[PDB]
Design a protein around this motif. Sequence first.
Motif, short mmCIF file in Angstrom:
data_model
loop_
_atom_site.label_atom_id
_atom_site.label_comp_id
_atom_site.label_asym_id
_atom_site.label_seq_id
_atom_site.Cartn_x
_atom_site.Cartn_y
_atom_site.Cartn_z
N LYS C 83 0.80 -0.86 -0.14
CA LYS C 83 0.03 0.37 -0.24
C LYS C 83 1.49 1.22 0.09
CE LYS C 83 -4.99 -0.99 0.19
NZ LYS C 83 -3.95 -2.29 0.41
N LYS C 84 0.33 1.94 -0.51
CA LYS C 84 1.21 3.69 -0.54
C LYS C 84 0.81 4.12 0.58
CE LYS C 84 -2.35 6.60 -2.04
NZ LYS C 84 -3.22 7.42 -3.31
N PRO C 85 2.14 5.14 1.38
CA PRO C 85 2.29 5.54 2.55
C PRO C 85 0.61 6.27 2.84
CG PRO C 85 4.01 5.91 1.37
CD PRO C 85 3.54 5.13 -0.18
N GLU C 86 0.86 7.33 4.13
CA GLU C 86 -0.52 7.66 4.58
C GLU C 86 -0.12 8.77 3.62
OE1 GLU C 86 -2.93 6.91 6.09
OE2 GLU C 86 -2.64 5.29 5.53
N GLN C 87 1.12 9.55 3.24
CA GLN C 87 1.38 10.37 3.18
C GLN C 87 2.53 10.88 2.29
OE1 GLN C 87 1.16 12.31 7.37
NE2 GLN C 87 1.50 13.76 6.82
N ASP C 88 2.68 11.87 1.06
CA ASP C 88 3.70 11.76 0.00
C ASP C 88 4.20 13.44 1.19
OD1 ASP C 88 3.60 10.28 -2.12
OD2 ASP C 88 1.63 11.00 -2.17
N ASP C 89 3.54 14.02 1.70
CA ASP C 89 3.83 15.45 2.31
C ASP C 89 3.78 15.17 3.43
OD1 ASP C 89 4.42 18.07 3.87
OD2 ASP C 89 2.37 19.24 1.78
N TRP C 90 5.43 15.36 4.60
CA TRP C 90 5.17 14.75 5.70
C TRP C 90 5.24 15.76 6.12
CZ3 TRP C 90 3.67 10.37 6.78
CH2 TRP C 90 4.13 9.06 6.00
N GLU C 91 4.95 16.95 5.74
CA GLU C 91 5.14 18.45 6.76
C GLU C 91 6.30 19.15 7.17
OE1 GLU C 91 1.19 17.90 8.88
OE2 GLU C 91 0.89 16.29 8.40
N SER C 92 7.01 18.10 8.00
CA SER C 92 8.24 18.47 8.85
C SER C 92 9.43 17.14 9.36
CB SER C 92 8.19 20.02 10.30
OG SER C 92 7.29 18.67 10.84
N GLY C 93 10.26 17.72 9.60
CA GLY C 93 10.73 17.02 10.41
C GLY C 93 10.58 15.89 11.91
N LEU C 94 9.80 16.83 12.78
CA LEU C 94 9.39 16.52 13.97
C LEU C 94 8.11 15.57 13.38
CD1 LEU C 94 8.30 16.08 16.85
CD2 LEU C 94 7.47 18.23 16.41
N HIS C 95 7.26 16.08 11.98
CA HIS C 95 6.43 15.23 11.97
C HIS C 95 6.47 13.95 11.34
CE1 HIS C 95 2.17 14.29 10.90
NE2 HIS C 95 2.35 13.96 9.70
N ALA C 96 7.67 14.27 10.05
CA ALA C 96 8.17 12.55 9.71
C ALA C 96 8.42 11.70 11.30
CB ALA C 96 8.62 13.31 8.94
N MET C 97 9.53 12.26 12.10
CA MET C 97 9.67 11.06 12.73
C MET C 97 8.75 10.63 13.70
SD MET C 97 13.02 10.90 13.07
CE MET C 97 14.54 11.32 12.36
N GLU C 98 7.15 11.59 14.08
CA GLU C 98 6.85 11.38 14.97
C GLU C 98 6.03 10.34 14.33
OE1 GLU C 98 4.40 14.25 16.45
OE2 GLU C 98 5.68 15.00 17.42
#
Lengths: 173, 173, 173, 173, 173, 173
Positions: C83-98
């Motif tokens: 399945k494709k991931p939930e986002q292509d835009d991961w918003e920020s370094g903090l959001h990606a890490m979370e």
Amino acid sequence: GPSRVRQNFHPDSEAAINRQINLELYASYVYLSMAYYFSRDDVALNNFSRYFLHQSREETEHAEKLMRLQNQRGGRIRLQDIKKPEQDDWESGLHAMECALLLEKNVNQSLLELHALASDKGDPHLCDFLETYYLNEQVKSIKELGDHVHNLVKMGAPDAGLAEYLFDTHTLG
Amino acid sequence: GPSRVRQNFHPDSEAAINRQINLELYASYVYLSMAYYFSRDDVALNNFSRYFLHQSREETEHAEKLMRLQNQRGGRIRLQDIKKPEQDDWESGLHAMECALLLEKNVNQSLLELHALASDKGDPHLCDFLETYYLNEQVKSIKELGDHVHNLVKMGAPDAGLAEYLFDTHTLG
Amino acid sequence: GPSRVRQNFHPDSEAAINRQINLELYASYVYLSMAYYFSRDDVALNNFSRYFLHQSREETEHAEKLMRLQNQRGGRIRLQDIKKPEQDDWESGLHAMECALLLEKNVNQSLLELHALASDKGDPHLCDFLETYYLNEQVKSIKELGDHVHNLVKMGAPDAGLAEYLFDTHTLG
Amino acid sequence: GPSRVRQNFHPDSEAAINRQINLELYASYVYLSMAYYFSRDDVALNNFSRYFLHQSREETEHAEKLMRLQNQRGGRIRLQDIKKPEQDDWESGLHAMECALLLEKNVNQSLLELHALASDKGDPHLCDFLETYYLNEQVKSIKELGDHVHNLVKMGAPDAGLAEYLFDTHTLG
Amino acid sequence: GPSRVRQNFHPDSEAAINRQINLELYASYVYLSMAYYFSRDDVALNNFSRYFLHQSREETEHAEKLMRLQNQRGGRIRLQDIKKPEQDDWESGLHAMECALLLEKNVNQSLLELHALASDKGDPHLCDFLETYYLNEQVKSIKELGDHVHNLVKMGAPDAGLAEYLFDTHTLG
Amino acid sequence: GPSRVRQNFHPDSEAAINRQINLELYASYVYLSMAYYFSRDDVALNNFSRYFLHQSREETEHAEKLMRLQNQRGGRIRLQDIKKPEQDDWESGLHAMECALLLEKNVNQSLLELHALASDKGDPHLCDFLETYYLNEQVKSIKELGDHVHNLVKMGAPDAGLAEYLFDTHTLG
Ligand SMILES: [Cl-]
Ligand SMILES: [Cl-]
Ligand SMILES: [Cl-]
Ligand SMILES: [Cl-]
Ligand SMILES: [Cl-]
Ligand SMILES: [Cl-]
Ligand SMILES: [Cl-]
Ligand SMILES: [Cl-]
Ligand SMILES: [Cl-]
Ligand SMILES: [Cl-]
Ligand SMILES: [Cl-]
Ligand SMILES: [Cl-]
Ligand SMILES: [Cl-]
Ligand SMILES: [Cl-]
Ligand SMILES: [Cl-]
Ligand SMILES: [Cl-]
Ligand SMILES: [Cl-]
Ligand SMILES: [Cl-]
Ligand SMILES: [Cl-]
Ligand SMILES: [Cl-]
Ligand SMILES: [Fe+2]
Ligand SMILES: [Fe+2]
Ligand SMILES: [Fe+2]
Ligand SMILES: [Fe+2]
Ligand SMILES: [Fe+2]
Ligand SMILES: [Fe+2]
Ligand SMILES: [Fe+2]
Ligand SMILES: [Fe+2]
Ligand SMILES: [Fe+2]
Ligand SMILES: [Fe+2]
Ligand SMILES: [Fe+2]
Ligand SMILES: [Fe+2]
Ligand SMILES: [Fe+2]
Ligand SMILES: [Fe+2]
Ligand SMILES: [Fe+2]
Ligand SMILES: [Fe+2]
Ligand SMILES: [Fe+2]
Ligand SMILES: [Fe+2]
Ligand SMILES: [Fe+2]
Ligand SMILES: [Fe+2]
Ligand SMILES: [Fe+2]
Ligand SMILES: [Fe+2]
Ligand SMILES: [Fe+2]
Ligand SMILES: [Fe+2]
Ligand SMILES: [Fe+2]
Ligand SMILES: [Fe+2]
Ligand SMILES: [Fe+2]
Ligand SMILES: [Fe+2]
Ligand SMILES: [Fe+2]
Ligand SMILES: [Fe+2]
Ligand SMILES: [Fe+2]
Ligand SMILES: [Fe+2]
Ligand SMILES: [Fe+2]
Ligand SMILES: [Fe+2]
Ligand SMILES: [Fe+2]
Ligand SMILES: [Fe+2]
Ligand SMILES: [Fe+2]
Ligand SMILES: [Fe+2]
Ligand SMILES: [Fe+2]
Ligand SMILES: [Fe+2]
Ligand SMILES: [Fe+2]
Ligand SMILES: [Fe+2]
Ligand SMILES: [Fe+2]
Ligand SMILES: [Fe+2]
Ligand SMILES: [Fe+2]
Ligand SMILES: [Fe+2]
Ligand SMILES: [Fe+2]
Ligand SMILES: [Fe+2]
Ligand SMILES: [Mg+2]
Ligand SMILES: [Mg+2]
Ligand SMILES: [Mg+2]
Ligand SMILES: [Mg+2]
Ligand SMILES: [Mg+2]
Ligand SMILES: [Mg+2]
């Protein structure tokens, strides 16, 4: 068939080689039993253990050389059960060395009987094989074990508290 | 005594380890028999011989590790006769590989029973020992033998004249 | 067949391993998406990119080890869509890490369920496989991500202009 | 925004690059499936396995280079599900090679369509990218697979018992 | 919080790990006391001293690994006083070794209780941690101490004037 | 006895050395607690952790040197419980550094009192021991901690989001 390789190789010699294979495997197992006796927590003589483990591995090599001889001569290996050793508890370093000396003399006697059979059957290849790879190694082994028994006896083994420990550390170290 | 080292080590576990020691020594002897079958003048597949000889030596190592475990835990090694293998004539490279796969599955089943006993007796040291040194080595061995059986069957062993020869030279080389 | 190798391997375990293969491939794809988010010209945090790319490659390795396990045990790999991931835009370094921390906890929960099934089916090989190669790597990964989230939060990510930049350069450098 | 980097980059080209990314990831997954088919205990052709695993990794590299291109040009990556391959059971070494040749021709046709679009949109950077990194690698791959199919057919795969084995050992070794 | 990392980690396991941390620190202190007993001018067995100092440092390492585990799992370390050892005067090399063997068996029993709790709470990570880093190291330590006690007893420690001296020089040297 | 080595060594000095041994062991434990505070997932300052762990190990060395002194002089080591530190939660990098500075000043004051006692008892060996191995190391430690506190305060610790992070990376790196 006979084997296309077989020549001057008597059925009695073939059978006696199979018996000798079993005896060498049996010797290997006796020494394996001894090796792990000496690493018990209530014996803890690690150099006796290594000494007997090395002897066990040598006996396996002796068995394998006879198996190779059987194939080289066109005989057929016939394996039998390997009997368990007479003891699991080998009592002391001195007792183990005495049992090992007796085992080596017994194996020697079998090899001499094998050489006498090979002579009787006019098999000089087999006579030479035993002389080259077995008879002198057996004499050296018996002499080494005799030396070790002597020192342990003179040092006061097994009852003298320092004797087996000091022999372990110096001689077998 | 009990042994001054013994702790959390059930008599049933001690006895089952002695049974497993005998089975590993038996496996060693089966593979030794196979190794020297392949160096007969009328078989002459030297890489099959080396393959089985290596397996034989590995089984001895497995036996020795259990003997060391018995000592480490304060149990007492009790050796039994090593039964002769079921055949001296192993018929073909394919047949030997099939017999070896069955032997490994049988030894696996014994190890799983041993692990089930150790779990029942709440012995996580013994469970960990089997998992770390035995269970995954057994799975790898069974898979390797399965692979070898498959290739020999597909190549047309034992009747196809080139199959065992080519497998000997390429795969086992 | 069953497979000639199969032993003590329950069909439910085989199916659960196929499900876990898909989840690891899915994790690999999530981290691949994140890696290339961080090399956008309007994000441009090259060490975040390298961090996630490395995680993506690790997940592929985890998937492959399970595929090898399936073959070793005689099960049959059954692949499903990734399945494709939930986002292509991961918003920020903090959001990606979370998001990565949540993904790792989810994958952990699946592995714990797999281990519980293996225990229920008396499969100590499979239990050992998960413990040896998966459970502790997952705990280390979750702890590392927790540490990274903490530092980014304390530093004032994502709104503090220097926070992600300085974390990129020092921690992930 | 547009992106501050974007120049001479048509939305249709951006979308076609996203489609090509998915196709390369799909190719990677097909070859991954093939690799683990060849390490089944009832297939056991380890060099076919390594060949396809290497191809799988190459496809991932091709996907990643397009993802980097999307970022370099200021386009936005949009990932989609990676469809499962058409088979888990790839039947034989010959059948896998034939499927791989068809897959490579299909991927080639997509790349040629992409190059035609880039030409139509007057995008010589994109044309050059495809020519430099894709078109000649695809022609080499198709030729190699054609060669492998030919040899396997001539050797009598899949039914000839020695054909896949000998190809595995010599050509793919 | 709970901790953002915490997963499948029972409060009872967290508390039992804190208790085990204290016990390992206590063991470290017992061996430190022993080490400096053996460098008294009226004892002067420098290899006994080095042996126990090494054991003391190992116990500190065991404590630290549990502290790291607590952090990795999201538990909170709670330290308690480290009780002084039962003796400052350890009487003899044999007596110290006997006390050390009892201490190791006591620490073993605590670790087995910890593993039983982890099993009860379905925490295979914690079970694996104990099995991998603790249970087999404890069995090895108990066996080594059992071996040392045996040799010292057989040699006639503590009253035989040469026994501790010779053990110091050879075994512990 | 007195000890056959004892000379010019007052019972009050012997007792004060035992008290100082306990204080150094206590300092070691305070720094151990701090080290593992900084590796919590919600603190995650790995260079603060390494800094305090190094300090902990140094304190143990200081304790051991006093234990060796006690033996060299013919005094008898008398160990006491090591009290737990005042906190498990050390609140911040700045707070830990401030607590460490206070601890070092307290240990300094004890060493100065010890030196005053040694002077009063006309023990120049003991005076020299403290001067050579303790007094200047303590002054260096207090100065280093004072420097670290100053920088953290000026940088805006603990509330300034970048301060502890940047200090961790640059100064303690
Ligand atoms: Cl003849
Ligand atoms: Cl001698
Ligand atoms: Cl004599
Ligand atoms: Cl017991
Ligand atoms: Cl194979
Ligand atoms: Cl088959
Ligand atoms: Cl099954
Ligand atoms: Cl971090
Ligand atoms: Cl936080
Ligand atoms: Cl900076
Ligand atoms: Cl544009
Ligand atoms: Cl070709
Ligand atoms: Cl053709
Ligand atoms: Cl060939
Ligand atoms: Cl939890
Ligand atoms: Cl010993
Ligand atoms: Cl005893
Ligand atoms: Cl005095
Ligand atoms: Cl500073
Ligand atoms: Cl200031
Ligand atoms: Fe010898
Ligand atoms: Fe030899
Ligand atoms: Fe040898
Ligand atoms: Fe030799
Ligand atoms: Fe012999
Ligand atoms: Fe019998
Ligand atoms: Fe002999
Ligand atoms: Fe002669
Ligand atoms: Fe093997
Ligand atoms: Fe081995
Ligand atoms: Fe080996
Ligand atoms: Fe090996
Ligand atoms: Fe085995
Ligand atoms: Fe029989
Ligand atoms: Fe085996
Ligand atoms: Fe060839
Ligand atoms: Fe990682
Ligand atoms: Fe890796
Ligand atoms: Fe890796
Ligand atoms: Fe890695
Ligand atoms: Fe994973
Ligand atoms: Fe969808
Ligand atoms: Fe992961
Ligand atoms: Fe377990
Ligand atoms: Fe910097
Ligand atoms: Fe390629
Ligand atoms: Fe490449
Ligand atoms: Fe490549
Ligand atoms: Fe390549
Ligand atoms: Fe491609
Ligand atoms: Fe579908
Ligand atoms: Fe391709
Ligand atoms: Fe140790
Ligand atoms: Fe260590
Ligand atoms: Fe160590
Ligand atoms: Fe060590
Ligand atoms: Fe310990
Ligand atoms: Fe007390
Ligand atoms: Fe210990
Ligand atoms: Fe394990
Ligand atoms: Fe310092
Ligand atoms: Fe130092
Ligand atoms: Fe130091
Ligand atoms: Fe230092
Ligand atoms: Fe100090
Ligand atoms: Fe208190
Ligand atoms: Fe200090
Ligand atoms: Fe001075
Ligand atoms: Mg006989
Ligand atoms: Mg049996
Ligand atoms: Mg799923
Ligand atoms: Mg498509
Ligand atoms: Mg306690
Ligand atoms: Mg005090």
